[PDB]
Amino acid sequence: LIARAVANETGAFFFLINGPEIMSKLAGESESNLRKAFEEAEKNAPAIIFIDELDAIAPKREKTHGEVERRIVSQLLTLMDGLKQRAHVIVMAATNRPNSIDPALRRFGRFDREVDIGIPDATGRLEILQIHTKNMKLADDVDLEQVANETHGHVGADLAALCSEAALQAIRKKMDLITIDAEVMNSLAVTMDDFRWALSQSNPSALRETVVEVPQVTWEDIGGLEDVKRELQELVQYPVEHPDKFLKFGMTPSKGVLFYGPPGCGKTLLAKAIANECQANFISIKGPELLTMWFGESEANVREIFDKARQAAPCVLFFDELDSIAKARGGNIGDGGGAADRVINQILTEMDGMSTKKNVFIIGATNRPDIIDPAILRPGRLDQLIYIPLPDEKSRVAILKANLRKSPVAKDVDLEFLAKMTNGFSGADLTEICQRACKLAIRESIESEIRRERERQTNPSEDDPVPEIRRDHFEEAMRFARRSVSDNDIRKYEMFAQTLQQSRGFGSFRFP
Amino acid sequence: RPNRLIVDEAINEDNSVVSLSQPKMDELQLFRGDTVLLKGKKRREAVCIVLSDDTCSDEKIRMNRVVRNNLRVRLGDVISIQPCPDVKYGKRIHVLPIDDTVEGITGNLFEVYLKPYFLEAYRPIRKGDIFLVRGGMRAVEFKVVETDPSPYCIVAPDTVIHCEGEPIKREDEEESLNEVGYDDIGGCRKQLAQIKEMVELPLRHPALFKAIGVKPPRGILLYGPPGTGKTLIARAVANETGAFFFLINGPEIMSKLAGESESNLRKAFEEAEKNAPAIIFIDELDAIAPKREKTHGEVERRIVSQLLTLMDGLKQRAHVIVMAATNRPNSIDPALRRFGRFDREVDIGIPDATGRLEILQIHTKNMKLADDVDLEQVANETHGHVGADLAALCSEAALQAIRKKMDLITIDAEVMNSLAVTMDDFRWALSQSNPSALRETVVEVPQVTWEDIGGLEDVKRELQELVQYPVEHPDKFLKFGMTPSKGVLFYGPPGCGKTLLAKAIANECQANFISIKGPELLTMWFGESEANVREIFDKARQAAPCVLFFDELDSIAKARGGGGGAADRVINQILTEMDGMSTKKNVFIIGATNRPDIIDPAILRPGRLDQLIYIPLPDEKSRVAILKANLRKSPVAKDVDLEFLAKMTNGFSGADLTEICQRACKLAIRESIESEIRRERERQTNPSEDDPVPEIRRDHFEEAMRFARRSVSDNDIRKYEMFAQTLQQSRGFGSFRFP
């Protein structure tokens, strides 16, 4: 669609080469078809030759077993090289991944410009839904924003299928009741019922794909930590907002930072917030992914990750648990080996090879800064160490408000008081309290609905019993509230930070 | 016009019964037994008895395939329903067999087929109607070429029921009942409904879809173990929708010479194009287009590319749906699963006990089974049987009966009808079964209920809140803006009903239940096949709503010692799959572990098995319920006081109570066998009855309690209680009151 739209809007002649179609033809006929396509593009220049499923024609040389396949790949390379004489003919080609095709095609003069379409974000999904529902008559009930937010893992073909499924659900509903009359279609409409049913029946095709998008988190979602906000700004926003200042003062922007602190205190929230403030893409590498690379010895994939971060820049590449592999080896005492491991070694290799001009910022997070490999805290690496402590009262209030944003909460509740009485609670604990309150409210609502329906059953002869989460709901939820971070863990983190700070003497330094 | 009604699938198998929804006969003013002359296409009339039912929709009329065919209508069509009081009885009806259906049956065809039909059953018969009599083990079609009070008559004992020989030739516009239909398919009612909803609109209303201008389903990939009748499903869908059916056989295509295979594929797609709307079924798709790695020759890749090209070119073909059969989604080239290709998918899977019973009824439909057989018992005992396996089992039972008859003794139909299969034959066939899907993962709604495990009311409430509420009240969760919990972790002494609890909660929500035992996790760990975890979750995703149960999450931790950390490859993959699990899908993860201490902490984080539920040893009421459930299928003397037995079994796990019940049952069996041996020995020594032990007596339970052991020591209970108390003590802040 992108290639055809570009050709149509620029007025260029569009020629489509389907890889499977080329490979379907007998030996020699594939070469003839490729040559004829390129000749036709030459004749109608300016032209765009779009090769769909390029990996079908020219996969990795290992995947090309037959001699005719290699001959076809060589013919494609020859045509790409001969483009030099072919006046203003551009060849676009679709592929699943850059490594899916023969590397010889990615050389200069051949497919050298590359664009990663990737997966649409919530805004992108909303745009796609609006495009595919343009003709569709939709009831005022449907808000495509909610569908876009809920359609994670969809690519656009998935969204088109979802819209078609909703339309067909509506048509099925209105078909048994009733060449076909367009008045029925105008009357026909789709509601959130149809769209939610389609969402339930939809099978996203890009759930495994890495998410690369600007996070919707903001500094308000995590109050307090103003000093951490300032440090993150200086380390991410300034190099991208004011490269001129860094050039003038001749400083190299820091490549990354390492968050350390109690679990579930908002390190991920902080990384997403700083990515959002700079409107930079955010890539999250969770601890399970690092452990998957370590167990499977797939540390090569680390390179791919960084490529992704390089491809979508400026970026905040976030490693949720850098100590995950260290813990998996024992961590506190570990095995007989040292702190170095294959996956973290590859991370260091990629960080060293990162061009600072690309504005890709690495943020590591760890609840065990002691067991992190020291080689990653060196200059030119995650040199800065930032302590993310347990949220303070203002931070707790902000976290509670952020959690209770999609939940209708009675004005009677004093979130300020609740935050006041939750000293020592991590953000995870506050989220647990809010979820418990929502659980109690939902249970009360369902029980009241059951009682009402039973009353109707016993008496054939309506308002929401509980439309909001009430003061009593939170009071009950606080009974199950627990502090996941004990005072001993806080002491450990405070001792680590104090050890780091004590070495920072020489503060009584003054020029003469 | 009230007479307009939509044809629908029948429940009752009678060929002259049309069911109607309860609020509709009154509107049309019927009498639950009145003769109604339904009108269909081609100016076809069929007179039938109108029954009543609840499941039927107000505007829907349930019709069996025979009445549908003689009315020249299909499911979803519109027919005119109106009473036919002028249905007076008749004197002579000239029925005649169809040539095809009696091609090899010799006999009277009356007192065997036409007599049991119409006997004590006043079936209204219209001239030209074709009715099916399923007797012996054939299904004979009989066409009424003449009735004395034409066109409609009622068969009565005072009727000639005249018939002759010379079977007539089936006319062009007659769809032989031997053709596959939805009634010929069992064990995939859910998947069959999915496929029907997918393909009915594009096929039943092609031009309406074209003017519609919305994307139709192009490729439907039915996977599941072989023998589940996927070809049967496709053929039935094509027949019931009137769509042209073209069968492409993978091996047949690959057998042809290079180029001839391409020509065959192209010609198949062209033929489907011509006779649109059409269904192209590609049986054994993996044969044509396996994983590219499996494909070696140039011709193989060329034929795969040709198939992809045809699938992509479907866009210009008039309402042609391509269905393909495969063992697993990964068995075929990934390029086939792209959009514009086999993007729609259905997992037929192995049938469940209900599905197995449906299949057995379908395959024994013609069989003149003895009254002794209860197909429910066979369906319950045929675990691991695909539809093909059950067909083979029914065939083997019939062959056993035929062999016995031949030993007692082109063939007379009377003895064939007399020939009856008994539960002895079915059990013999079950012994010589060799099911083909014993190792396939079982995905079904468990039959366990909360009654099988009494007590644990708080655990019942938690499980309900965590599983039933999100699937039964999504609106509430949306309103309150809560994300349903992804899963829970049961912990407690072994054999205390954790599996029972998971199965019970799955049953209450009528959700599929997938059990992953500790040996499976250890197999993935030892073989380093943790990738299989993904497949498991995929399966669970395919069967949503589902309760994915991990019986021993600590199995790998135990296998490692219970020097490294708690992380391991298999549990790491479980974490990865759980994180990538969309909460919109109602897949609920339940983990069970006798050793919560050695469980990887990463699994207990929010967004994972965050809730920890302690399943203690059964209390007295739970013990009574466990004893009752264990002995449900065992004849137990009324003298036994299960309440007293539960009272005296404090500290016993559910496994211990099951052991006691099994010990008593085995003692009773031993006593029965010894008494029978003694009785036959006496008969031999004194040739010269009643069951010596018809039930498990109280003495048997008293003897069994001698060997009764407490599998869970007080120290283990202390450990679990200490764990629970450590969890609880952290949950302070109870004295929190808003100002």
Numbering used by the authors:
A (entry chain A): 253 to 430, 436 to 718, 724 to 774
B (entry chain F): 22 to 430, 436 to 588, 593 to 718, 724 to 774
Give the text the authors published on this PDB structure.
Its core function is to unfold ubiquitylated proteins in an ATP dependent fashion. Previous studies have established that post-mitotic Golgi reassembly requires presence of VCP, as well as two adapter proteins, VCPIP138, and p4734,35.
Two-dimensional (2D) class averages from initial cryo-EM data sets revealed the typical hexameric structure of VCP with additional blurred density visible at the carboxy (C)-terminal domain of VCP, indicating significant conformational heterogeneity of this region. We obtained a consensus reconstruction of the VCP-VCPIP1 complex at an overall resolution of 2.3 Å (see “Methods” and Supplementary Figs. 2, 3 for details). To better resolve these regions, we used symmetry expansion followed by focused refinement, with masks focusing on the N- and C- terminal ends of VCP. Using TR-FRET experiments, we assessed the effect of nucleotides on VCPIP1 binding and find that the absence of exogenous nucleotide behaves similarly to the addition of AMP in the complex, suggesting our complex is nucleotide free in line with not observing nucleotides bound in the structure. We also observed that the complex is highly dynamic, including within the N-domain of VCP and throughout VCPIP1.
